[PDB]
Amino acid sequence: TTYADFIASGRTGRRASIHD
Amino acid sequence: SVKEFLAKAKEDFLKKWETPSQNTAQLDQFDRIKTLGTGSFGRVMLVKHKESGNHYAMKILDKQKVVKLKQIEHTLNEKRILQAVNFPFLVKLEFSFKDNSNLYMVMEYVAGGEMFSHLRRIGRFSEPHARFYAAQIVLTFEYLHSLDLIYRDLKPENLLIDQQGYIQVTDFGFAKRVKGRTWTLCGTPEYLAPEIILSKGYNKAVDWWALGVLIYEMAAGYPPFFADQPIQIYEKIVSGKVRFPSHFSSDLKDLLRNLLQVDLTKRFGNLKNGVNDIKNHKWFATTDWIAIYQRKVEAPFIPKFKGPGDTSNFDDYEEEEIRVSINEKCGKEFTEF
Numbered sequence: 001t002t003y004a005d006f007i008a009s010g011r012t013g014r015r016a017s018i019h020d
Numbered sequence: 021s022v023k024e025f026l027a028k029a030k031e032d033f034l035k036k037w038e039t040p041s042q043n044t045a046q047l048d049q050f051d052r053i054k055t056l057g058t059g060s061f062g063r064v065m066l067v068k069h070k071e072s073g074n075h076y077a078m079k080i081l082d083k084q085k086v087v088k089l090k091q092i093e094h095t096l097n098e099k100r101i102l103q104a105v106n107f108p109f110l111v112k113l114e115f116s117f118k119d120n121s122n123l124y125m126v127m128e129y130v131a132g133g134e135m136f137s138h139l140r141r142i143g144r145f146s147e148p149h150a151r152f153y154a155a156q157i158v159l160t161f162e163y164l165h166s167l168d169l170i171y172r173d174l175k176p177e178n179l180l181i182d183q184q185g186y187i188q189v190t191d192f193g194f195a196k197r198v199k200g201r202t203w204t205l206c207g208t209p210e211y212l213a214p215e216i217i218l219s220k221g222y223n224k225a226v227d228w229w230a231l232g233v234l235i236y237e238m239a240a241g242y243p244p245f246f247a248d249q250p251i252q253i254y255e256k257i258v259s260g261k262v263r264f265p266s267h268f269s270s271d272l273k274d275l276l277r278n279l280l281q282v283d284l285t286k287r288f289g290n291l292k293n294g295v296n297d298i299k300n301h302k303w304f305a306t307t308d309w310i311a312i313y314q315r316k317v318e319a320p321f322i323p324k325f326k327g328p329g330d331t332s333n334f335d336d337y338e339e340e341e342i343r344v345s346i347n348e349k350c351g352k353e354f355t356e357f
């Protein structure tokens with residue numbers, strides 16, 4: 001499932017801004 | 021009537037815009053208690069203001085860090101804008117000041133924690149719950165945009181939940197006063213509109229895009245475009261193919277297709293009727309715009325609070341000495357702060 005895929009991803013925590 | 025509210029809103033804002041407040045407190049007026057969240061340039065602390073006994077959140081920024089990443093102008097923007105605005109869903113800047121080493125912004129303490137926290141824990145928000153929050157973002161963006169401001173950092177991590185369960189928008193680090201287009205590649209990857217990514221020059225429509233991302237994430241429990249690395253996320257955004265959960269209503273999906281619209285000539289919020297395309301969409305039919313503005317709607321979720329000082333709604337963070345050099349750092353750069 002999409003949820004499962006999300007939850008196994010490395011981006012479930014607080015996300016950092018970027019400013020490149 | 022909204023035109024007239026907005027009109028007088030703009031007068032108030034411009035006065036402060038043109039003559040910003042400066043140097044309204046000092047470090048020794050507060051006892052620092054605990055870290056509420058950390059950031060690229062420092063951290064935010066729960067503090068207690070000695071003379072009043074009030075709690076606040078003190079954003080501490082290391083000038084040298086700011087310079088190092090070339091974030092001077094953005095930081096100045098952040099403070100200039102924040103001190104000038106006034107809206108029910110915008111966090112209030114209470115004091116600001118600087119010392120040899122750091123910049124300080126002291127805001128009202130929003131005790132309910134980040135929307136993030138709640139969202140990840142609960143999993144996802146019901147559509148009525150999501151809509152309550154979205155409505156507040158809509159009104160807020162209508163406000164900011166009307167002042168020639170773009171916000172540029174919408175995400176659950178920047179939205180605090182107050183003691184009444186209403187939203188408090190925080191982090192104006194990328195907010196900017198702009199008439200016409202701008203080019204800075206900034207924001208957060210999952211929330212970037214395609215035109216930012218494509219290096220095209222962009223306007224306030226990017227905020228409306230982000231709104232779509234937010235509403236999706238709120239109702240789904242995961243973002244519309246995710247992957248392990250920013251670069252693969254950008255690929256997806258640009259494709260703009262979006263898939264919706266089985267449980268999303270027709271109305272929701274329709275709103276989303278119009279916000280997550282790659283074609284600027286088609287994106288809701290960017291058309292002749294502007295925000296009214298949003299306010300008037302079927303997904304918001306049950307929404308009372310005035311009652312929301314007036315904070316009369318009863319919130320779907322109300323954080324537990326025990327007392328002033330309670331940080332239970334916040335993750336713990338490692339603490340560290342606040343250091344203030346005896347030598348002034350980046351004095352000229354930050355003259356107007």
Ligand SMILES: Nc1ncnc2c1ncn2[C@@H]1O[C@H](COP(=O)(O)OP(=O)(O)O)[C@@H](O)[C@H]1O
Pocket residue numbers: 056057058059060061062063064077079111127128129130131134177178180190191192193
């Ligand atoms: N007014 C506030 N009340 C309570 N907590 C806050 C307040 N402002 C910031 N925080 C906490 O600190 C975190 C970082 O604040 P933020 O402005 O986003 O700093 P940064 O720009 O470095 O990300 C927020 O996500 C929240 O956890």
Ligand SMILES: [Ba+2]
Pocket residue numbers: 059177178191
């Ligand atoms: Ba932030």
Ligand SMILES: [Ba+2]
Pocket residue numbers: 017191193194
């Ligand atoms: Ba920031």
